[PDB]
A paper describes a structure:
[name] (Trx) and glutaredoxin (Grx) are small ubiquitous proteins acting as cysteine disulfide oxidoreductases in the cell and belong to the [name] superfamily. The [name] [name] found in [name] ATCC 14579 is conserved among all the members of the [name] group, including B. anthracis, B. mycoides, B. pseudomycoides, B. thuringiensis and B. weihenstephanensis. Like E. coli and C. ammoniagenes NrdH the [name] have a α/β/α Trx fold typical for all members of the [name] superfamily. The [name] protein has a C-P-P-C active site motif that differs from what is typically observed for Trxs and Grxs.
The crystal structure of oxidized [name] was solved and we have related the results from the phylogenetic analysis to structural features, enabling us to map parts of the protein involved in hydrogen bonds near the active site. The [name] wild type and T8A mutant structures were refined to 1.4 and 1.18 Å, respectively. In the wild type structure residues 1–76 and 3–75 are observed in chain A and B, respectively. Due to the insert of one Leu amino acid at position 44 in the [name] protein, the α2 helix is positioned slightly closer to the β-sheet layer compared to E. coli NrdH. Additionally, the residues Thr8 and Thr53 in the vicinity of the disulfide bridge are possible hydrogen bond partners for the buried C-terminal cysteine. Contrary to what is seen in the NrdH-redoxins from E. coli and C. ammoniagenes crystal structures the Thr8 residue in [name] has a rotamer where the hydroxyl group is pointing away from the buried Cys15 Sγ-atom. This orientation of Thr8 is stabilized by a hydrogen bond to a water molecule (HOH34). The proline residues apply restrictions on the protein backbone, making a rigid frame for the active site cysteines. Both proline residues in the [name] active site have the trans-conformation with ω-angles of 177° and 176° for the Pro13 and Pro14, respectively.
Numbering used by the authors: 1 to 76
Write the structure that this text describes.
Amino acid sequence: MKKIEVYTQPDCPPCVIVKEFLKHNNVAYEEFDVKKDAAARNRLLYDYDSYSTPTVVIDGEVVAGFQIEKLQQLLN
């Protein structure tokens, strides 16, 4: 796992919101598009046990869905 992973897909405004929040905060993330990257899709569903995007993984912690304040907490 990378230290900060962000799972997204197209036509997903909540994903854009999370990403842009992360960017505004100058967070060093890596992003994965689960429609275009099958491995990333498999990690989301079968490693992280998350059914939707956005999902962010922060040093192993899975934050599934739209949870801004939990992200702020976890990031520093």
